[PDB]
Amino acid sequence: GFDYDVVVVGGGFAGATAARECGLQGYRTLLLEARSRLGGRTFTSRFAGQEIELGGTWVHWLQPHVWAEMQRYGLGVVEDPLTNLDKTLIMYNDGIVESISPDEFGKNIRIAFEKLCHDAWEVFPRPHEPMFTERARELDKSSVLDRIKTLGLSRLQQAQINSYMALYAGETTDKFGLPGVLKLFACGGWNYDAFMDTETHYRIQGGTIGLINAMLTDSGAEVRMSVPVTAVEQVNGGVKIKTDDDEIITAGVVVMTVPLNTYKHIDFTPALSKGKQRFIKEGQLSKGAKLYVHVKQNLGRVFAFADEQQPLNWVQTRDYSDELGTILSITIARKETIDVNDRDAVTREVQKMFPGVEVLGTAAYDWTADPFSLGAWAAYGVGQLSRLKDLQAAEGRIVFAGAETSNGWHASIDGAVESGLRAGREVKQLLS
Amino acid sequence: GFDYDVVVVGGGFAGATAARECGLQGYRTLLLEARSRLGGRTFTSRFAGQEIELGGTWVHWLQPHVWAEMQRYGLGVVEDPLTNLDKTLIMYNDGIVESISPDEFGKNIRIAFEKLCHDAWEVFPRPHEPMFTERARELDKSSVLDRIKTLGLSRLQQAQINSYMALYAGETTDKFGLPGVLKLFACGGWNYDAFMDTETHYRIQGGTIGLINAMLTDSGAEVRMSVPVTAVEQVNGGVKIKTDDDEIITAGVVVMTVPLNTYKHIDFTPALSKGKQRFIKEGQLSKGAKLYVHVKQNLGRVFAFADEQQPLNWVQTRDYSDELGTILSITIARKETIDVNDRDAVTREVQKMFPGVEVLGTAAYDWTADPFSLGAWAAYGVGQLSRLKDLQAAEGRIVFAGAETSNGWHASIDGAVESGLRAGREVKQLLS
Ligand SMILES: Cc1cc2c(cc1C)N(C[C@H](O)[C@H](O)[C@H](O)COP(=O)(O)OP(=O)(O)OC[C@H]1O[C@@H](n3cnc4c(N)ncnc43)[C@H](O)[C@@H]1O)c1[nH]c(=O)[nH]c(=O)c1N2
Ligand SMILES: Cc1cc2c(cc1C)N(C[C@H](O)[C@H](O)[C@H](O)COP(=O)(O)OP(=O)(O)OC[C@H]1O[C@@H](n3cnc4c(N)ncnc43)[C@H](O)[C@@H]1O)c1[nH]c(=O)[nH]c(=O)c1N2
C-alpha cells in the first residue's frame, strides 16, 4: 500500500519512455523532474525566428527505438542541409582554417573512419551485446588515440578524425575509450556512410519536446517539475523517496534515469553495489556544450571540423538565406576551450573560423555547468564499457536506466529510449 | 453504441501489433482470425525434436519496429549457423551443383549485389519514403532482370544473384519490380554485408509465436479464431462486419490486415477505391513455400543457392551433429517447381543437391495453396511500388495494414509490425 506503484526519477527520454510503459500497464505512476522543464539533455527552444535544439537533436531510422516511437506517434523527419555542401572547413590545432573541396573532404573523413573502425565486424558482430566477443574486452584497454596513432593517416585525415573523436568524447581523445566508438559504428550498419547519416542529418518533426510530451500524455502519469530527489531508501518491501525539501513519497519500485554524473546529489540506503559506486566515482567523460550563432552573411550549406585544441569542433548550417543570413549550429567538445555564455569570446572564435562575418546573436547551453546534467552525451573512458553491466543491474526494488546504461546507441536519444523500454519491462517483472 | 470500438481482422504480426496498440489505449477491441491458429505467415512448429519456423523466421536489430518489440518484451536473438560455413553450393538452372570455396562464394555474391544496388544511396536516400526521389519512380518501369542484364556479371555471380532475386520475388525475376529491392538494400544500411546479415542469421528467442502471444496478452483484446470475415459494410457512422456464418459484429473502426492476395474473400460496401481495386486484382507476386528436411548425415554448416528453374532455391543449416544428422531449412521461390507435400519428389530434389544423403523426414508448408495467405512474403511486380499509397490509404472508417502496406521492410515481420503501429495511430485519430 504505497503512494504509487512506481516513481520515475527524471523527465528526459529515458524517464518519459519508462513512465509511458508503466502507465499503459495501469500502474499508478509518478514522474519527478528536478528542472522546471522536461526533456533533460534535450531542450527545444527558439532563436532568431527558428525552433532550435540546444541538446540532443538528430535521429535516424537505423536507430530502432526512437524510430519505432516516431512511427507510433506519426512524427516525420526534418532534413538539415548536410548534402550538396558549399563549404567544408578544417581548423587545425594550430589555428589554421583550410577550405577543402567538399568531395575530397568527405572522401578523407570516410577513409579515416573506415581505417579507425576496420575490425568493427569482427569485434562487434552483435553491437547490442557489447561484450559478446573477447576481442571487445581486450580492446577496452585501449583509447581511441592509441588506435589513431597506428593508422598512419594523412594530416588532413588525422585532424578530421581527431576532431570527430574529441566531439564524441567531449574530451581529448587520449581519454576516450575505443570499443564504445567501434560499437556505435557497428550500430550504424558497419559502414561509414550509413553511420555518418545517423548523426547530424535528420531532426524530429515537431521537436524532441513534442515526442517527450506525446509519451507523457499517453502515459497518464502524474508529472511534477522542480522536484529534485535527494535520497532513496529501500524499506518495508518498497522504497521511500525523499526530495530536497524533505517530503517523502513511497512506492513499490523506483526507476532512476538521472545522468550518471549527477548521482552525487542522491543518497542511497542501503548503499549501492561496489561496481555502481565505482561508476559513480568515475562518471562519464563528456564536458561539451552547444551554441547557435546568427550571422548576417549567407554562408550557405557549411560543415566544419575543429581539432581538439580549438573550441568550435563541429559546425553545421541550421538555416540560410539572403534575407535571414545564416544560423550556425556548433557543438563544443570541451567547455574549458570556450565560455559559450561569453558573447565576446564567441564572436572572436566564430570570426577566427569565418573571418569577415558580423555576429547578430547567440543562444548557448552549457550542459557541463548545469547541475542536472554535469556533462553532455554519454562518453565512456578507458575500461568502462567492460563494466557496463554493473551500471545496468537492478538493486532490489530500484531500476536503473538512462542512455549511459543502454547497450546500443548510448550517445543518443535512441539509447535513452532503449533504456526506458528495458526499465518498463523490469518494473513489470518486479510488480508480478 | 457499437459492439466494439475497433475490430482487427487478422492475427499475424500486423494485427497483433494493432490490437496491442488499441487495447493499451483502453479501446474495446476484438481480433478476428480466420485460421484456427495465430501467427499468419509465421508458424512456429516442431520437427525432429526441434522448434522450427515454417514461415517468417529471421529478424535483426537494424529492423527498427520488430527490434523495439523485442526490447519491450525481453526477447534475445538465437543465432543460426551462417558463419564459418563448411559448404557453399550453387545449383545452376541446368541442374549442375558446384561446390565453391566459401570465401569466394561470399565475395561473388557481394560483388553481384553491390553492382545490382549501386545507386541505392541516390535512389533511396530515405527508404521509408519509397517515392521520395524522381529516380525511384522512373526505375519502377524496370524489372530486376532488366538491371541484371546490364551488369555483365560472371556466370557464378549471375546465377547467385538471380537465385537470390527469384527467392525474394517468389517468381521469375523478369516479373520482379526493381525499386522494391533497391529499397530493401537501403533499409539494410546501404551495404551488402549489413543487408545480408538481416535476412537469415538471427531468430527470435522463444519464437515468432512467443512474440505474437506477448503482444496479444498485453493487449487485453478479445481474440476469436476460425472466424473468417467475408463482408464489411460502412453504415450508421461505423462498420458492420459479417463472418462466413452470417453473424454480424458492429464497430466504430475496422483494421484490415489480411494478405493482399486474399482480399477476394471479402465484399466491401461501399466498394473500395479504384486504386485499391487495381492492387487487389493484381495481387502480389510471391508463390513460395517452405520445407525442412532431416537427413541422417552430418553435413555441417551449409548454404546453397539454386537458380530459378530449380526448386531448392535457398538452403541453410538449421541444426547439425553426428548424433542427430542434419536439419536443412529450404525456401522455395515457386511452388510450381516442386510439390513440397510430395515426399518422393522432395527426396529426389534434395539428393540432386546433396547426392548420397538418406532422407529421414520432412516438414513443409505450402503458403501459396493456403487460402488465408495465397502466396508467401510480399513481392511487388513492375510498377506496383509507385502506387503503394493507394493500398495504404484509409477508406472512411476502414484502416489497412499488413506487410504489403508498409514503407520499409515490406518483405519482413518488421514491415508487418510497422503497419500495425501505423494502424493503431490511425485508429486513435478516427476515434478522437
Ligand atoms: C549538447 C548535446 C547534444 C547531443 C546530445 C546530448 C547533448 C547534451 N545527444 C544525446 C541525448 O541528448 C541523450 O543521450 C539523451 O537525451 C539522454 O536521455 P536520458 O533520459 O538518459 O537523460 P536526461 O539527462 O535527458 O534525463 C535525466 C533527467 O533527470 C533529471 N534529474 C537529474 N537529477 C535529478 C534528481 N536528483 N531528481 C530528479 N530529476 C533529476 C534531469 O533534469 C533530466 O531531466 C544526442 N542524441 C541524439 O540522438 N542526437 C544528437 O544529435 C545528440 N546530440
Ligand atoms: C515462408 C515465409 C518465409 C518468410 C516470410 C514469409 C513466409 C510466408 N517473411 C515475411 C513475414 O512472415 C510476413 O511479412 C509477416 O508475417 C506478415 O504479417 P502480416 O500480419 O502482414 O500478414 P499475415 O498473413 O501474417 O496475417 C494476416 C492474417 O489474416 C488472416 N486472414 C486472412 N483472411 C482473413 C479473413 N477473411 N478473416 C480473418 N482473418 C483473415 C490470416 O489467417 C493471417 O493470420 C519473413 N519475414 C521476416 O522478417 N523474416 C523471414 O525470415 C521471413 N521469411
Numbering used by the authors:
A (entry chain B), B (entry chain A): 51 to 482
What does the paper say about this structure?
Nicotine oxidoreductase (NicA2) is a flavin-dependent enzyme that catalyzes the degradation of nicotine into the non-psychoactive metabolite N-methylmyosmine (NMM). NicA2 acts by degrading nicotine in the bloodstream before it reaches the brain. Clinical use of NicA2 is limited by its poor catalytic activity in the absence of its natural electron acceptor CycN. The higher in vivo activity of NicA2 is due to the presence of a cytochrome c, termed CycN, that acts as an alternative electron acceptor to O29.
The ligand-free structures of the wild-type and v321 enzymes are somewhat different, with the crystallized conformation of ligand-free v321 closely mimicking the NMM-bound state of both wild-type and variant enzymes. Analyzing differences in deuterium uptake between wild-type NicA2 and v321, we observed an increase in deuterium incorporation in NicA2 v321 compared to wild-type in both the ligand-free and NMM-bound states. Increased uptake is observed in the area surrounding the putative tunnel in v321, suggesting that it is more accessible to solvent. The 19F spectrum of NicA2 v321 was strikingly different and was composed of a broad upfield-shifted major peak at −60.2 ppm and three highly overlapping downfield minor peaks. We observe that compared to the wild type, NicA2 v321 appears to have greater exposure to solvent in a mutation-rich region encompassing a putative O2 tunnel. This tunnel is also more conformationally heterogenous in the ligand-free condition of v321 than it is in the wild type. NicA2 v321 is active in vivo at a tenfold higher efficacy than wild-type NicA2 and can maintain blood nicotine concentrations at undetectable levels.
